[PDB]
Design a protein around this motif. Structure first.
Motif, PDB file in Angstrom:
ATOM      1  N   UNK A  21      38.288  52.994  54.494  1.00  0.00           N
ATOM      2  CA  UNK A  21      39.408  53.594  53.371  1.00  0.00           C
ATOM      3  C   UNK A  21      38.652  54.784  52.300  1.00  0.00           C
ATOM      4  N   UNK A  80      38.239  40.252  54.189  1.00  0.00           N
ATOM      5  CA  UNK A  80      38.273  41.536  54.219  1.00  0.00           C
ATOM      6  C   UNK A  80      39.873  42.612  54.060  1.00  0.00           C
ATOM      7  N   UNK A  81      40.784  40.846  55.186  1.00  0.00           N
ATOM      8  CA  UNK A  81      42.416  41.524  55.387  1.00  0.00           C
ATOM      9  C   UNK A  81      43.122  41.841  53.617  1.00  0.00           C
ATOM     10  N   UNK A  82      42.461  40.846  53.180  1.00  0.00           N
ATOM     11  CA  UNK A  82      43.135  40.334  51.559  1.00  0.00           C
ATOM     12  C   UNK A  82      42.341  42.069  50.467  1.00  0.00           C
ATOM     13  N   UNK A  83      42.318  42.062  50.986  1.00  0.00           N
ATOM     14  CA  UNK A  83      41.281  43.106  49.633  1.00  0.00           C
ATOM     15  C   UNK A  83      41.523  45.133  50.805  1.00  0.00           C
ATOM     16  N   UNK A 119      44.260  45.302  52.743  1.00  0.00           N
ATOM     17  CA  UNK A 119      46.497  46.217  52.196  1.00  0.00           C
ATOM     18  C   UNK A 119      46.112  47.126  52.029  1.00  0.00           C
ATOM     19  N   UNK A 120      46.100  46.781  50.318  1.00  0.00           N
ATOM     20  CA  UNK A 120      46.699  48.257  50.307  1.00  0.00           C
ATOM     21  C   UNK A 120      45.880  49.223  50.349  1.00  0.00           C
ATOM     22  N   UNK A 121      44.890  49.338  50.494  1.00  0.00           N
ATOM     23  CA  UNK A 121      43.796  50.862  51.760  1.00  0.00           C
ATOM     24  C   UNK A 121      44.194  51.861  52.463  1.00  0.00           C
ATOM     25  N   UNK A 177      39.253  37.144  49.164  1.00  0.00           N
ATOM     26  CA  UNK A 177      38.239  38.332  48.449  1.00  0.00           C
ATOM     27  C   UNK A 177      37.501  38.941  47.747  1.00  0.00           C
ATOM     28  N   UNK A 178      36.442  39.455  47.986  1.00  0.00           N
ATOM     29  CA  UNK A 178      34.668  39.716  47.187  1.00  0.00           C
ATOM     30  C   UNK A 178      33.448  38.782  47.395  1.00  0.00           C
ATOM     31  N   UNK A 189      33.048  37.522  51.144  1.00  0.00           N
ATOM     32  CA  UNK A 189      33.534  37.963  52.975  1.00  0.00           C
ATOM     33  C   UNK A 189      32.627  37.105  53.525  1.00  0.00           C
ATOM     34  N   UNK A 230      33.429  52.514  46.331  1.00  0.00           N
ATOM     35  CA  UNK A 230      33.746  53.310  45.588  1.00  0.00           C
ATOM     36  C   UNK A 230      34.876  52.681  44.685  1.00  0.00           C
ATOM     37  N   UNK A 236      38.720  46.964  42.459  1.00  0.00           N
ATOM     38  CA  UNK A 236      39.442  45.430  42.945  1.00  0.00           C
ATOM     39  C   UNK A 236      38.213  44.691  42.449  1.00  0.00           C
ATOM     40  N   UNK A 245      48.069  36.450  53.669  1.00  0.00           N
ATOM     41  CA  UNK A 245      47.463  37.633  53.293  1.00  0.00           C
ATOM     42  C   UNK A 245      47.623  38.621  52.282  1.00  0.00           C
ATOM     43  N   UNK A 246      49.454  38.493  52.201  1.00  0.00           N
ATOM     44  CA  UNK A 246      50.526  39.175  50.891  1.00  0.00           C
ATOM     45  C   UNK A 246      50.362  38.417  49.636  1.00  0.00           C
ATOM     46  N   UNK A 254      48.092  35.244  49.021  1.00  0.00           N
ATOM     47  CA  UNK A 254      46.722  36.005  48.693  1.00  0.00           C
ATOM     48  C   UNK A 254      46.276  36.996  47.716  1.00  0.00           C
ATOM     49  N   UNK A 255      47.224  38.488  48.331  1.00  0.00           N
ATOM     50  CA  UNK A 255      46.938  39.225  47.731  1.00  0.00           C
ATOM     51  C   UNK A 255      47.647  39.651  46.108  1.00  0.00           C
ATOM     52  N   UNK A 280      45.483  40.148  42.761  1.00  0.00           N
ATOM     53  CA  UNK A 280      45.501  41.219  42.330  1.00  0.00           C
ATOM     54  C   UNK A 280      46.499  41.240  42.043  1.00  0.00           C
TER      55      UNK A 280
END
Ligand SMILES: CCCCN(C)C(=O)CCCCCCCCCC[C@@H]1Cc2cc(O)ccc2[C@H]2CC[C@]3(C)[C@@H](O)[C@H](Cl)C[C@H]3[C@H]12
Lengths: 279, 278
Positions: free
Chosen positions: A130, A169-172, A174-176, B150-151, B153, B201, B207, B269-270, B272-273, B277
């Motif tokens: 990350x 995890x993949x959802x989070x 993606x932009x990393x 997300x979060x 998991x 981080x 996020x 994935x796209x 839900x992101x 967010x």
């Protein structure tokens, strides 16, 4: 610079063949850390590496207990390069039998290895990826993580759990620029007893167990892939510039999967799977 | 002869409201064993039962910790009728945060309660149902067991795991006359910043804030009353030909369809992101 790869569960099957496949690739771009629970099982690995002429420094073995985060941390610290470009979480356990025949110890261990072991690996290795903005995580999945299989209740639980874990995890991620993928395998041909089962359950459930085991043997004869073929799917995923969350190693369980995904009530799947297995 | 129902996690929420709903049903056809981890938390349960005039003997409480097969066994021994007609596996735990910020014992605990807890219950009560040729199992599911959030998991891993356990069992139980169903709920109305920031981080921390903001708003829009959810359990309980999965709301069904239409997971994935967010 080589692509540094760490693979869990390399004593046999998919992990063994993936490790030697990457290490022996004509390009010489992979450095593979192949991990094993017991060092005494590493002979098959080294024979395979020798037969495939893996060049010097392409393959290193480490001892790794995925149940112990100190073992996981020590494996991380043995990566002399200070990065892992590709993490392959492959160590796993099966558990087959009637739910009421399964020891609680066995249930907890299958979860601790398949699920919590993968968590431990991601906890240890995701932060550096990350912060770097790069890295690939490949997870050994199963058709048993996509649809429920009788007498594999706890195994399917553990593989369904990885689906949830990885998708969350993949959802989070993606932009990393960190990419996670499941490799969904059907049956794979690789290299406690029936008496205890019968003692811990009813005679009729045992007969259903026999029938399931007979159907499963037939499935293997029609459809089993080998680890060499599965390894090629891991390669395809790791080479893809924009990898997807799931790769299927075979098309053979897709008609069943469609039945499941087209009826969210689960009615079509349960009847159809019951018919598939028990006639 | 009444329908004997045993329900886990009855100190509040879905389990409390389902227990009192069945105990106070005008038909008077239910005998409810409401179980709780600690009997000292049973006040709200019984206050609710009194306000709904549950008859004497419609409702009993037992101590049952789903983490301990000795407790499960002792609770089973207290069921005076010698059968359970409906087992409701409901006791559960949440876990929210950056994966790398979660402690190993919290991770282990969510799996032990949400998954192994249900295994313990099923091991104790399924054998008698199978050999009687009848019984209904109802299990509290989540939208988090149907799609990755997300979060969440580890929470999602535990609810996905339940899905796989129950589905596998349903296939086998079909000829035994035992019917298992999941009740899929949306959210139900029932660490410090600096500590989280220490364990991850800056970008993940950001996020996390965003997910928490979006989740607050989904909750206002969408959170369900436990009475509604309990009513959906009763619908499933009385279905002549019960199905594997009941949904308590339509709200998350569009996202679910998008998940099911693309097995590769790219669309989900796209999408839900973007939902979470922006
Ligand atoms: C073989 C066994 C039974 C089975 C039945 C089906 O109708 C469809 C697929 C399968 C197999 C898929 C591959 C599995 C899940 C393996 O990972 C374990 Cl060993 C059981 C296997 C499954």
């Amino acid at each position: 610079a080589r692509t540094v790869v760490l693979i869990t569960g390399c004593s046999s099957g998919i992990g063994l063949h993936l490790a030697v496949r990457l290490a022996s690739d004509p390009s010489q771009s992979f450095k593979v850390y192949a991990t094993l629970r017991d060092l005494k099982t590493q002979g098959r690995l080294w024979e395979a590496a020798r037969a495939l002429a893996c060049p010097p420094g392409s393959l290193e073995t480490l001892q790794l207990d995925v149940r112990d985060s100190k073992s996981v941390a020590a494996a991380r610290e043995r990566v002399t390069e200070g990065r892992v470009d590709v993490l392959v979480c492959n160590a796993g356990l099966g558990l087959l039998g009637p739910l009421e025949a399964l020891g609680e110890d066995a249930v907890a261990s299958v979860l601790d290895v398949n699920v919590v072991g993968t968590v431990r690996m991601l906890q240890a290795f995701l932060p550096d990826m990350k912060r770097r903005g790069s890295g690939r995580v490949l997870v050994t999945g199963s058709v048993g993580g996509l649809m429920g299989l009788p007498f594999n209740d706890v195994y399917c639980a553990s593989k369904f759990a990885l689906e949830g874990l990885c998708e969350s995890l993949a959802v989070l991620l993606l932009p990393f620029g960190v990419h996670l993928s499941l490799i969904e395998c059907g049956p794979v041909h690789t290299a406690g007893s029936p008496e205890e089962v019968l003692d811990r359950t009813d005679i009729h459930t045992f007969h259903r167990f026999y029938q399931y085991l007979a159907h499963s043997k037939q499935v293997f004869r029609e459809a089993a892939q080998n680890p060499e073929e599965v390894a090629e799917v891991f390669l395809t995923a790791l080479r893809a510039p924009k990898p997807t969350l799931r790769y299927f190693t075979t098309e053979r369980f897709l008609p069943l999967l469609r039945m499941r995904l087209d009826d969210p009530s689960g009615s079509n799947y349960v009847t159809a799977m019951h018919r598939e297995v028990f006639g």
